[PDB]
């Protein structure tokens, strides 16, 4: 089918144990991504793609976060974690107001072709870096509710 399927969280730069970014592999079920600690200032998590393909559209939902940047890359070289190109800059869906007056605490958004670079989106990648950004917590963690890529 013309879609994208994740395999496992290749890299993790903000994931806990019980509620880890690997829960993104199970969008439905009943678990999402949660930073490894509280004080959600910025969290990063690279997910692996079950197949190297091009990216034309994406559907990721924010779980209290506000800024969401996504980079693209392949398994080439190996655990480099430094050879990805900014497919789509950080997307601002919410802000630190939701963390104050529940102003839409849980929202979601997608990234079609207009939100992805054509010089890279059309390149077959198999690894993606997901980074959320917005200082809103301190004692409790948080992150994203789900991530769904689609070619």
Swiss-Prot record:
The keyword Ubl conjugation applies. Phosphorylation by CK2 promotes interaction with APTX and APLF. Sumoylated. Its main location: nucleus. Keywords: Chromosome, DNA damage, DNA repair, Isopeptide bond, Neurodegeneration, Nucleus, Phosphoprotein, Repeat, Ubl conjugation. One of its GO terms (molecular function) is enzyme binding. Scaffold protein involved in DNA single-strand break repair by mediating the assembly of DNA break repair protein complexes. Negatively regulates ADP-ribosyltransferase activity of PARP1 during base-excision repair in order to prevent excessive PARP1 activity. Recognizes and binds poly-ADP-ribose chains: specifically binds auto-poly-ADP-ribosylated PARP1, limiting its activity. This is DNA repair protein XRCC1. It comes from Homo sapiens. The chain holds residues 1 to 151 of 633 of the full protein.
